[PDB]
Amino acid sequence: QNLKVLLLYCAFLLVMLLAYASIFRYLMWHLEGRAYSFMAGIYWTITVMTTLGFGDITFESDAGYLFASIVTVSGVIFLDIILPFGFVSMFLAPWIERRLRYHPTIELPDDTRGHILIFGIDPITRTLIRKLESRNHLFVVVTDNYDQALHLEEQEGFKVVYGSPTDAHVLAGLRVAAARSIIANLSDPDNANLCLTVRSLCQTPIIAVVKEPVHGELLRLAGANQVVPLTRILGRYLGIRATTCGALAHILDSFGNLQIAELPVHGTPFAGKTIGESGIRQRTGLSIIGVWERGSLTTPQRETVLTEQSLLVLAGTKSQLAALEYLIGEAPEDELIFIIGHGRIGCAAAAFLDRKPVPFILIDRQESPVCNDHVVVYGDATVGQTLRQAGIDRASGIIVTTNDDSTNIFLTLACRHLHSHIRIVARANGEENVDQLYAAGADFVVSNASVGANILGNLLEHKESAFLSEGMAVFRRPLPPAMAGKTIAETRLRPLTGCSIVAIEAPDRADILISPPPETILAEGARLILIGTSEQEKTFDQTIAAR
Amino acid sequence: QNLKVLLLYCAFLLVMLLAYASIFRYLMWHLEGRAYSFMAGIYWTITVMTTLGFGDITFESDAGYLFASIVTVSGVIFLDIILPFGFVSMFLAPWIERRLRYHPTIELPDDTRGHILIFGIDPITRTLIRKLESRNHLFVVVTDNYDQALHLEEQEGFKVVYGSPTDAHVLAGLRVAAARSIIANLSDPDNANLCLTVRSLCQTPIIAVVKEPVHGELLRLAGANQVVPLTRILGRYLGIRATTEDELIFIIGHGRIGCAAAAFLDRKPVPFILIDRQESPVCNDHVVVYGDATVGQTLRQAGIDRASGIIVTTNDDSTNIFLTLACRHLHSHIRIVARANGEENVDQLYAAGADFVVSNASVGANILGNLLEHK
Amino acid sequence: QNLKVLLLYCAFLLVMLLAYASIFRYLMWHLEGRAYSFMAGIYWTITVMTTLGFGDITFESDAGYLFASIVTVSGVIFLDIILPFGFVSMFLAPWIERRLRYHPTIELPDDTRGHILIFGIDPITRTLIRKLESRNHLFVVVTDNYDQALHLEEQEGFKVVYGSPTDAHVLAGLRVAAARSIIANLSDPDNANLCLTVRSLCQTPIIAVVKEPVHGELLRLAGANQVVPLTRILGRYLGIRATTCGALAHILDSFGNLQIAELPVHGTPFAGKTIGESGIRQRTGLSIIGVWERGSLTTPQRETVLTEQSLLVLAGTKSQLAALEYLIGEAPEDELIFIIGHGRIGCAAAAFLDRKPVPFILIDRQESPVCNDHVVVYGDATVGQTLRQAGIDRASGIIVTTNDDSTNIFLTLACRHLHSHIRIVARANGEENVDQLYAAGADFVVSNASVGANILGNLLEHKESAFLSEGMAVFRRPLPPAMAGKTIAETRLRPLTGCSIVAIEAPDRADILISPPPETILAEGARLILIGTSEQEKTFDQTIAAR
Amino acid sequence: QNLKVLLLYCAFLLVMLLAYASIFRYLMWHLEGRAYSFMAGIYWTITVMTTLGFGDITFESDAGYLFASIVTVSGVIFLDIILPFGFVSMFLAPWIERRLRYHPTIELPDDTRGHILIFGIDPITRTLIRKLESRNHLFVVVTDNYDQALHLEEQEGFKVVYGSPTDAHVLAGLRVAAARSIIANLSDPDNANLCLTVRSLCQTPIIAVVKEPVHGELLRLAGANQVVPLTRILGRYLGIRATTEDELIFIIGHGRIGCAAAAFLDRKPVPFILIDRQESPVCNDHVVVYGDATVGQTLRQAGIDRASGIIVTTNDDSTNIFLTLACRHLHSHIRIVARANGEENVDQLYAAGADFVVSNASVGANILGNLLEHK
Ligand SMILES: OC[C@H]1O[C@H](O[C@H]2[C@H](O)[C@@H](O)[C@@H](O)O[C@@H]2CO)[C@H](O)[C@@H](O)[C@@H]1O
Ligand SMILES: OC[C@H]1O[C@H](O[C@H]2[C@H](O)[C@@H](O)[C@@H](O)O[C@@H]2CO)[C@H](O)[C@@H](O)[C@@H]1O
Ligand SMILES: OC[C@H]1O[C@H](O)[C@H](O)[C@@H](O)[C@@H]1O
Ligand SMILES: OC[C@H]1O[C@H](O)[C@H](O)[C@@H](O)[C@@H]1O
Ligand SMILES: OC[C@H]1O[C@H](O)[C@H](O)[C@@H](O)[C@@H]1O
Ligand SMILES: OC[C@H]1O[C@H](O)[C@H](O)[C@@H](O)[C@@H]1O
Ligand SMILES: [Ca+2]
Ligand SMILES: [Ca+2]
Ligand SMILES: [Ca+2]
Ligand SMILES: [Ca+2]
Ligand SMILES: [K+]
Ligand SMILES: [K+]
Ligand SMILES: [K+]
Ligand SMILES: [K+]
Ligand SMILES: [K+]
Ligand SMILES: [K+]
Ligand SMILES: [Zn+2]
Ligand SMILES: [Zn+2]
Ligand SMILES: [Zn+2]
Ligand SMILES: [Zn+2]
């Protein structure tokens, strides 16, 4: 905007130059019978406007004086006044105003498309934003807190809009209809308000983070396409890690056929062994679809070594999962788990452990404003002997789930020092504290930020197949010996049935190929893992054998 | 104004030009016997002060040199010093004091007339302003809160004054004596303070919004022309909509409005149950089933099953929307009447499953509006 | 500071001018054999430095070119660079910095003398400051709150210093030793800290405002020269006004001889009558030393009309005060006073009324964190029927003493409307609310700001005789018939005894002359009122009759 | 730096002068057969670019006019545009970003070495800084509080960094690996967090101030080189001074220090009474006579009469001074030992009537000081 105005002025200056120069030659002729070249004209005009004033070329008539006077003043006005002033107004003012005074972005440009709207900022969404700035996605966070808008503007991995998140006018300004996705991370009532409002304008996909698992249904009603119960999930990931021996934990039931479960390896016979060595698939018929270690989901090799902290992601039938449970295959007696901190997450960890059930003891300073179903031992875990009196002595494991990382680090320190034996699972509110929890003696650390970010992140990237795979199903099929040697693109599987190949594992191998390329040459005995509508799965074995 | 001082300077600059041009000709003639035209003198004076300096016309006598030096310096002082120093100190100064540091308005111009003072801005009075915009009244909102004056400045269909509403000196700078009308929408004690203070200056008509219907008489006594008990009226609208035996009405929210709806249902009478998470600081004539309702089964406990009606009257619109969702979810047909604190939530309450929605801001703005028009 | 530097530069410019001009004439001569006048030199030099460059006088030698080049550049540097830059640094920067950014005054100039230090800002001291800015006294308020320092700096009836009030280093910076007076209006512990610290540096007089009358002694110990129990005093002024009929209230006992008391006129036989008509002095022998009405203490005339709201200031012997009490002279039966608000002031009003005693009832929302001696009826006076249930019906008077003026205005309104008979005394936290309390129906309004300011103000102005009259005594003496016709300056009373004439009243008149001028001619039967040490009062009737 | 860019510009300006002067002579000769000296060319080029314009030397050919025009414009661009635009954008910009808007330091220079990091600034650590000033160490105080960093900026004998003490990236920018020593004066949990974080980067010696003596072992475990239990030590100093039957000691204040003094007196043992206005959030092994003492007769009630000693241990110096006054007033000779949180109140406690004063900041600074010197 400003640049155009600038060298638009430069153009007007040039025209003034040529004009004055042309008039100069004209006057010198018709007024004093003197003839100057075009160059002399430019030369003189520049000499005057610029106030050099050599004086080698001057007029002698009053009319010439009147003209020279006019050009002279023109130079001062357009080179000594307008020019600097305009620079102070077009450049200087806008700079100092927008650097000493926050001017809130209240609206988004009309041409904004495919952007991601973030409502409700916190560690989770902050980490999500930094993570997807590593891909340069257009993020726009919204907030109705002036002070927060400022803080978010000084440092920016994203644009910040300041306005009421639940005002349809404000949502129209954000271009919600043209937006790619929407993260609803406000309170549950505000989320419900947000979803209904957004839905009155568009069908833009919405991912809501629910603070209380019971409200999940309500948010789907208000218009949310996906609901993520973070605290429930977080409590669960603390829980599955607290037992003395890892146990199967169910994840998904794809229409009562394919089951997805996860298994922490600690204290199991699989610890220390390799995937091939443990022979999990041979003895259970299960598919190992991934190994989660060091915050990275890798593909299962046969030489891969399972560590105490490894976590297997598994897929198969109900009986195949029951086989694995038998192999583990039993829990030690008198298991007792202390849970320090009875907030939403600690509360969820308790609920998960009760689903089994494993005996536990909750400990917190004050009564829960949201929970009534749990009996809590009241006291300050930091104040001497509060844990001793609660009988921390016969505990087999501890979950430290305070909302303060330094306190969790201190408790992990003390517990590991007084009980070098028990499992210690700790929670990190921020990732800048994860390593210290390990250094303090924790057997595993669950990070709010990374778990939250990974989930939301994946829900985002796989959006083009999120609402798709939503309502649909994942199933497994023994590759028909008829296609033994044919390429995925050659079989033309999708155009017939409608499903999609998401994995191909060898007959006698823990080695699996995830998201195989069309060029992949199929083999004999191979086991396919497909995904599609609960209609195409039945129209699969039908359409495939037909044509 | 900065325009007058500016062109008044151009005036002085012009006089200086003519003065110097004339003195020029005079010296050229009397000192050196040289005759120059008027244009020549203007041309020379401009040439010197503008520092161009063609040199085609110079003196040769000492007195001429002196004069030439004086004009040169004049051009530097009045064109290269005062002009810019003026520029910056004249209007680049106001810029900082009004754009780098928020400067609240603490007084209206002397001749401000026919304006409507608003005391206590909120959804109702905000809806009032944007409603009578076509009538093009000058609305002035008054507030003793700095941060609020600041926020009311950025976006506007109304002027914002910052000061104590109950201070006589502040009201005089607001020109209350010349105002069209005054809307008192503060606490009842504050309203009373405001009325008596205003009445000591003038008899500008005052429309007071009163919280407790009993206080209506006192506000009149203080000097209010009209008293509007909105919470009673809004409560009545809720109670009316929730009815038109074994009829049983759940009222979620025991604030003033919810309380008024209960009071209304007694007159019928229609059995009802009040539900809140706190005790009423102003009410003690109603029985309230305490315990937060957003949790989940607090309504199930109370028995949202055998009820015939539900009134949602929290002072938070999103909470109202959530409760409406939950209710419509638990019971697909029970009559639900929801309260909307702001008109921007009216549509989401209906979308949530409400059968009727009472809009505080709409009913408020309308009543106050027809009270200003019919005056 | 800046101006000097400015026209110091102007001087250096002039010297440069004369120098270059002198060198010019020199070079033109010894280099080109040309002779120019002094004026031509100045003219040329100005022509170059200023960049006009007529060209009518130029050099032709390389050395001349080198010189012209040097002068030319000198002009650009000292007129086009330094000059504006210096203006931006000496003027522009200091202005924008100290107008967009608060720079705290941390110290006072070394030569600061006779100033008044204010510690602890509030309505009282704010009003005190505005009041004594009407006399242009040098006030300096001190505070350790950054945010408060800013607010006090934007608008200023005084300089503001930001620092710890109880730090001797900070006190030395304030020049406490050279200061006139010090107002200690902090908490009692902070005041005690302040006094001890100030006392370790100087003997500068200190006036402390105590928040709890019991701490008064402690503050005199720490070094305070004067202690003002504002809340006690305020409670008293509410109390003396609440009774159905005004009653004598003791103020000072000057060594068991001269007594000072005050009497509100409401409900007494003196109401409506004039001072002469009531014949108070004739019937009691008392001296009427002042009439306090409409916030102004005037001298008692005989034609002066006493109104319901008038307050007599009286002086005389114990029996003379007892005579007046008899004239009034009795209180109505079943007096019952409701006191709304049990803060420090309301509490003090109760204590005063108990000193008589008059039956009362305290009413407040919560228990007092400081009082234990009073039984309080708990409830919200604003919530319907709280006063009704307390039996406001049989009250003879009400004192409304909430810490919120609007609430006091509302209560005054309602009470006067439901009980048009009872006395209503109300308290104003700020003077901007006094008139409205009257308009609401209050019989009298006690203003914190004005009472506080008047007291402190007087303690200040009369400082030169404050600590003097402190410890001293005020006494009355029947003018000896020996000086019947002599002038105050002629009698030479002070040089003999040491006392001072503060009043002279006629034998048969309520007319009194306060602070009589030395020229005043004394009469016969006149009654003198003097002040001095409890040593000079005895050395009075002795020294006067002797010589 | 702004000096290099500046004189580097003067360098380019100089080259332009010589280039134009040489081109000048070349054109004058080849275009018009006129011969000019080197000084003449410099003199002409300066005369044109500086816009003086004497005119004593002008071209007469078109190509000369063109060249003359080019130099004129060069002087305007490089002397009347870039020079000032530079000025303002070069160093009048930094001025605003560092004087109109506080800019906290979030990172120390790469080569910072031998510095002492302070975490948790307070009277003790503040007294430490002003004490070892003659040794001329570079002390850096770290704080995650903006408003505190701002205040610590105006007055200084030490540099202030703003950031999370327990963030590894923040500690790396603080150059912990190259620091002389680290003083951890935060909460015990925070200290533990700080130690482990620091230990993952380096083995810089750490001196931790610990609140609860039991936590000393854990801080060591985290990685602290030395653990200083000040509250235990200060409490012991109080108890020691208050003694060296029917001996009875009043301890006013049951904070950690007051609590430590009580614990100390048990070992003697010497009978004592704790007096506070609240219950101890960290202690439950002592009986405390509750009820505020500043009111008046709370000490009289308890029996300040038959007592043989008084320890004043509130965490507020003025309150301590007041209590000392009141005590010395009620009893002219009973032994009084007062605690001073800051060294600026030590003298007023003695003036108030204390028999001995333990100075938290002095004892603190001394211990930590001799711990840094002897290292
Ligand atoms: O400098 C001019 C001068 O002119 C007058 O003096 C003489 C002048 O010197 C002669 O050249 C001639 O013009 O006649 C003049 C007198 O008639 C003025 O008197 C004098 O003021 C003035 O300076
Ligand atoms: O404009 C100068 C010109 O000089 C040369 O041309 C001629 C010139 O016209 C004659 O006046 C004389 O000086 O001899 C010159 C040739 O020997 C250059 O050739 C030409 O480049 C230059 O423009
Ligand atoms: O420069 C002005 C010119 O005007 C005309 O075109 C003349 O023919 C020409 O001689 C002259 O040079
Ligand atoms: O992810 C699996 C989830 O399945 C069910 O929803 C369970 O209620 C829940 O405990 C579990 O977390
Ligand atoms: O201006 C320079 C002067 O120098 C000497 O003083 C000469 O005597 C004089 O002729 C000349 O005018
Ligand atoms: O001013 C007179 C005062 O004398 C005494 O100090 C009384 O205790 C007090 O009630 C009264 O206010
Ligand atoms: Ca850390
Ligand atoms: Ca809405
Ligand atoms: Ca008022
Ligand atoms: Ca002190
Ligand atoms: K020029
Ligand atoms: K010339
Ligand atoms: K020029
Ligand atoms: K010139
Ligand atoms: K010239
Ligand atoms: K010439
Ligand atoms: Zn729970
Ligand atoms: Zn009610
Ligand atoms: Zn009391
Ligand atoms: Zn203890």
UniProtKB/TrEMBL annotation, chains B, D:
Q: Which residues cross the membrane?
A: 3-24, 36-54, 66-93
In the bilayer, the protein is annotated as: Multi-pass membrane protein
Q: Which residues bind Ca(2+) 1?
A: 166
Q: Which residues form the RCK N-terminal domain?
A: 113-229, 246-359
UniProt-annotated binding residues for AMP 2: 256-257, 276-277, 292-293, 339
Keyword annotations for this protein, in alphabetical order, are: Calcium, Membrane, Metal-binding, Nucleotide-binding, Transmembrane, Transmembrane helix, Zinc
* Sequence positions that bind Ca(2+) 6: 344-345
Q: Where does Ca(2+) 2 bind?
A: 166, 193
Q: Where does ADP bind?
A: 255-258, 276, 278, 292-293, 314, 339
The residues that the entry says bind NAD(+) are 210-211, 231-232, 255-256, 276-277, 292-294, 339
What is this protein's record name? TrkA domain protein
